[model samples]
Target chain A: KGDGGLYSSLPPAKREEVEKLLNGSAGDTWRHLAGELGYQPEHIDSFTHEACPVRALLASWATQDSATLDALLAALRRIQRADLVESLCSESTATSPV
Target chain B: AQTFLFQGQPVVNRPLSLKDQQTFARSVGLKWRKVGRSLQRGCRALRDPALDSLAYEYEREGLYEQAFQLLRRFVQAEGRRATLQRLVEALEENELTSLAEDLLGLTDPNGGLA
Candidate 1:
């Protein structure tokens, strides 16, 4: 995968899956994430159009870059969401030092 | 009371008489009551940016509790991205790591950083 283009490489279905897990209102997942990100829950809810939580999240970083990928992977690790890291990094061509 | 003539008008040069003082006190009381009522209906006069500024001041002074409260009010008034980020940085600066991480978490639904 080209560096910094992790979002572009993900399959559409996988992207949707990640979005559903993070943005859905069925649980406290969104709240926990918001707390970790130093944002209030309502702030995340305020995003509109493509800035919706799903798209905004993916757009925040150059995921394909090894450094960015490592940081993201570490964050997910902290939250015990290794599954997300695995899925997103499955096709990652860059090697993570962590 | 003494009255002095200034130009063409009479000006009071001494303290007010008892009746005048009472009247002045009553008017002042009425004005204060009106102000209190307006404040009760929600101090919309403060505006969102002003609230954010106040919150930032609180954050700068290391008053995390007050800062967090004011920041919440600001967000409720105007949930813009920049305003939200300000609150996030404030929390992080205050060493509210857990809270900061939680907010950062929301910025990326796929468990990435923004």
Candidate 2:
């Protein structure tokens, strides 16, 4: 479970569940940005934090490494969807549901 | 509901199209009037073609506020703010007014940074 390869270890069904959730509209955009910058967004669920995914994703793009990734994933797991959405919506110029 | 990519590879579970960009813009702060104006300006400048794309991408991904921050940077840039009203008025419509103001601010006694 601690191995960085958390996504690879998931059972097929569990991985599929994460995939379904990640494939949502919001997830899709993030996927595009992450892909352009070169980061695997599939590991979002592996971490217990919520905001960690976003930060890790960005950091990975800026600095490719595992420590930053793990820290970001941890941070993400701690964030609430409501707060994240609200903060992002307020900080961005783009239209958002939050 | 969030996906985190690792080792620098974006795993796209969902892909967004150009149409989605426009829809998301309306949902945000983009007023119908502003949209129309922006579009009209786009037509005039020929560079506004993908203007909605930025808004749409940011909106759908819940990064609208980031867009605003970027806009702030755009507005503050020397050459970028050439169209700013304050710049034009200060320099009497001089094309180099914005640059000069930026330079002046850099050396301004009160406005200069520490």
Candidate 3:
């Protein structure tokens, strides 16, 4: 985990939907994360700069490339938001208004 | 027509302030190395790179506060994965009982930890 830049190129879910779900839930997570997912040092460095650190980073993910649910889950796992991870994964088996 | 239904109100929480983080950071002191290892290894939220970044700050720059900051950030970011209980266990593992006590707000009239 420590050798070099941490980002992977795997695909994630579409950004259109992820925004609504992750925006509020991630809270200051951007404060100390979004690095392992990896971008240019400048890009990641900007994340080192932000509004709500985690959300700011999420905003970056919104456009920087793509974010898969797996990356989201991986990031959440890195941050220990297993609660978010669990709920995020469980969302597919969700409560859509019938 | 609508039948019976229930809903809840918005609830909130307080996040850490800079002052509190410094208080915690100060508590880390020399144990900064162990403190980081304690979390990445025990907390599991952190991987080796997580520890590496902390090292860049604490080890390279001599920003000891980073040691505690690293853990606190995880506590916030990781949520239940890095609970005070388990954090305390990590510190206790490295024999930073006093640092653990500090997090719990325990009084230590005498000095503790490295």
Candidate 4:
């Protein structure tokens, strides 16, 4: 309840898991996630700050009504369904941050 | 003898080193080409080790204004660490002090560690 209080909180294993899925060997997975999130495939640096938006969205979603949550979840799910990852991975070059 | 100021006190000075002064015409960077060797030679003549290191770090951080401020302060204070500390604290809320304390195990023996 309430994220297990301050001192007792687990140190965010989910974030690491998501980071691996979105930024690890699964480049395709990351690209699709980026596209679904309305990010350009070439602008990977945007993901560095995207965590703030994601945290805010999670907070809003938790407090939202069923309809809002459903709409949000549907949009997120549609990205997974579209298989845009392959397209993004194929179109983009593996470039440095510069 | 070249003219300069020390702590707003006028100082009639000579080049940092005879060799540096002799080679003052060598090209370097921007205005540095004309003055760089002589400036370094002067710093060396003064035995000011801290100034160049401070200048290097400031430049590396892309803080050109801070670097220039530090250079001017070095000239005015004769490269005294205490004066630099006070000036930096006055400018930036003692963040530099905290970082130095953490990294270098340095402390103000004056008992004002607050």
Each candidate's fnat = 0.00, 0.04, 0.00, 0.00
Question: Which candidate gets the maximum TM-score versus the true structure?
Answer: 3
Pairs with backbone N, CA or C atoms under 3 Å apart (clashes), candidate 3:
A6-A36, A7-A37, A7-A38, A12-A67, A12-A68, A13-A68, A30-A53, A30-A54, A79-B78, A80-B78
lDDT of 1 at B76: 47
Alpha-carbon lDDT, every model: 0.38, 0.33, 0.48, 0.32
Clash numbers, per candidate: 21, 30, 10, 0
lDDT of 1 by residue, A1-98 (tens): 32353445566544444553332122324344455556555557664333234445454432434324444555567767775555444433355545
Model 2 chain A poorest ten-residue lDDT run? A19-28
How much is A41 displaced in model 1, in angstroms? 3.8
* Candidate number with the higher DockQ (2 or 3): 3
TM-score of chain A taken by itself, candidate 1: 0.46
Q: What is the TM-score of each predicted model, taking all chains together?
A: 0.27, 0.19, 0.38, 0.20
**Per-prediction TM-score, chain B alone:** 0.25, 0.27, 0.60, 0.26
Q: In model 2, what is the error at residue A25, expressed in angstroms? A: 3.9
- Give candidate 1 misplaced runs (Cα > 4 Å): A1-31, A48-52, A60-67, A93-98, B1-114
Residue A29 of candidate 1: its Cα lDDT?
40
lDDT of 1 at A41: 55
Q: What is the TM-score of chain A in candidate 3?
A: 0.47
lDDT score at residue A68, model 4, on the 0-100 scale: 38
